[PDB]
Symmetry: D2
Amino acid sequence: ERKALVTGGSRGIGRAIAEALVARGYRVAIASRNPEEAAQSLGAVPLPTDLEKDDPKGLVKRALEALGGLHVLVHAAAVNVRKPALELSYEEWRRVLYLHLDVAFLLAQAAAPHMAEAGWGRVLFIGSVTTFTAGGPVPIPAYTTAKTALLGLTRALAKEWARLGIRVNLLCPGYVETELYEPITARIPMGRWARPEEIARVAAVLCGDEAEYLTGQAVAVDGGFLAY
Amino acid sequence: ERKALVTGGSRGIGRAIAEALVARGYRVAIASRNPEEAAQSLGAVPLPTDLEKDDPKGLVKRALEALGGLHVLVHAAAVNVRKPALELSYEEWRRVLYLHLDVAFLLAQAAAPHMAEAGWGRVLFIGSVTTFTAGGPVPIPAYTTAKTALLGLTRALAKEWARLGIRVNLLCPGYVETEFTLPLRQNPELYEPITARIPMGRWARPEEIARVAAVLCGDEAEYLTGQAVAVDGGFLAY
Amino acid sequence: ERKALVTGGSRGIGRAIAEALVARGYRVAIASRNPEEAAQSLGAVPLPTDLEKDDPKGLVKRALEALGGLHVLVHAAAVNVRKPALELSYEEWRRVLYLHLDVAFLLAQAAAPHMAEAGWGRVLFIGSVTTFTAGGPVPIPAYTTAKTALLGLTRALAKEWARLGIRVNLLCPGYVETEFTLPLRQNPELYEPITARIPMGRWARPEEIARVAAVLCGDEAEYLTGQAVAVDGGFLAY
Amino acid sequence: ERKALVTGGSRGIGRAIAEALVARGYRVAIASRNPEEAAQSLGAVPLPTDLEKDDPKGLVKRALEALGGLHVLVHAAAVNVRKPALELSYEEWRRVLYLHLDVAFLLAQAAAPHMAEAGWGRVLFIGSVTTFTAGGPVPIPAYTTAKTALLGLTRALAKEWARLGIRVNLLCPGYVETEFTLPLRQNPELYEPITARIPMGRWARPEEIARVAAVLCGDEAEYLTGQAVAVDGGFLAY
């Protein structure tokens, strides 16, 4: 009976989250460019889409109609341009910010009215260790900025929609399997990278009744990396 | 099968957490001054103790023997002295810091070896909105200090025990409806300004907080450690 | 001897910062739509510009030519669309995000090479208490997002340019008495709940914020980079 | 004119801060076990004391008498027991927490009335990168807890004393070359992993940290209170 839309749900963390939601009895729709196999394997509705191109509210409408309602939104679509600030063009910077941040805003804005109508909703943005740091040995200023920006959007939307029955949170995965590895892994207390399913367990919690009084927060699932 | 000890488990947030763990199928022991009756309604093992005076590792030893093992530790004992710093005595300062912080360290230190031999453990300290703020219209410097100190201890123990299979986190409840917070809730001069900052527009029921505590005490937290998780209806984000 | 460019330098915080830098002996250029009056009062070079519509790197080029170099960049330009997310248009969202965040990136990107050439540089972005909260009673989702995003950019650029002799930080002012915040002060429903949370019991002068900005634009910041420094009269700590 | 008391002022960061305050024209008193030589070199009043055992308030009383007043308090005393939680005794835990935290509370509590009297005051506690992390490869659970606890105390006291004209902040230095940190620098498995995370590629000099401490003990911090200011070469931002 709860209806969920997961962007970037055919691979990595997005797929793991979609699977976790199906396991909870949710009716799920997976949006990505080629969601056929993922939708078939997980038992979800496929919604082929190119979010760097297609109108976000158009996708929400498609999900609403395919699922017969909409209660949960998970934005896990990804893209990145790994270049330092001095080499990055305005176009590349905007490409990253658009998909991670602007699309997050537009998708949530479009989905909110439907969650409000149901009097229950869950919005889960996907953060990163770069929501709190600069990525360490990797040059990713645009990504870092976008993932940190999501924390602000998370607080802002959580404040605004709390009375509507909607909870808005930011799941920040640590280093997950989807001269750099060694130093990073040494900063992970658990001593290993995460399995997508391990991240998805928490995503599911933030998508369910467990988060009834939990909103406007970032939850880091990083094997102890940030605490190190 | 998993064995848990919850201090301050006879009422308030502690009881709600104990109740939530029992519902998850855990064998729970609750500690407080007089847990007999509470324990029986909850279906938990009572461990009478005054944590402001009794040796913490003595409690862990009793829990280990009563439960046949120990996998989860939740330190939810509550106490406070609502007085400004210039009025607070060092004895009062120490009373608050001892129960909330020193005892957290002692209990965790004593419980860790048992979790390590089981190869799986969960330590859940209880924070507060004062882990990130100073309590607003309420004068609680000692409490604020202790609850903020717990974030440091959380990170420290999480780092040290990660390889042992132990996860250590800090659950930070917002404003909850309990006898403990009644002096706050009943007084408009305090309740109104505080509640105006809670996006959800209401205080929480202990059970709503316990839902998240249960998660941090289970397999859902397999890769989650050294973190504070705030369940406050949007208060901090406001 | 140090050359500085301050956007939004003819009014409020920007003007106060420009005055503080001139007081430190820096050669300052201020950019705004009508900087003439302020430039001649402060003893700075006027750079008439519409930061929302003129190419950012072009402004940096003009500043470089007018000052004969560039060591300091302060992006204090301000703009806002105080509407809730459900009422906000994408164009409005973009107006706020562009000026506060995109322009911050573009200006810093254009200025960095000149600072690196000198082997010494200071980039100061301007944050807000909304870099850490959602603005409270004020409906400002776009502004909050942009000001929080700046902390990420601050960390990223600080890391990338640290060895070039450039320091990048985010000065986060609390509630300051300026024309930009006039709407907040004129509505009791915003002013009262906000001010009740400021321990110092008053809004802060632009000059009081500039005292700290000057520090972050000087040798005092030699080992300070990638950080947010909040000057809010105790608001966030409350 | 301004009268300041600096604990741990004969070495490392404490000494650098004392020197910076003297340079600002402050009348300084420095407290440590053997402050005679440092006091003479710096031009400050020596106040021999063992803060790990002597009554903190007696120290403030002595400072008041020696300086003819008291406007500034900097608690830079340092001690540590670098052992993991499972190897640390409660006595060692208490030793670290007492000196770093309890004494901070006692010293501030005793000094505040005198600052309020003057209508102007500055309390500067000393943090660490462990106020935000667990110390990485270094086993310091007690120190981490204490330095994080100070952030809570900083917020609490700042809120309570704001209207008295007192500002309370936490200066969090990164990795500084002092004999206190010598053991970190002497072992590659601590120094290398740590230094690799400092964007500036070097440890700080005590004086570089003192530059910021001076700012937090002056008029520049008029509207800055209840905050932590990290001076770490970009470490936390990495």
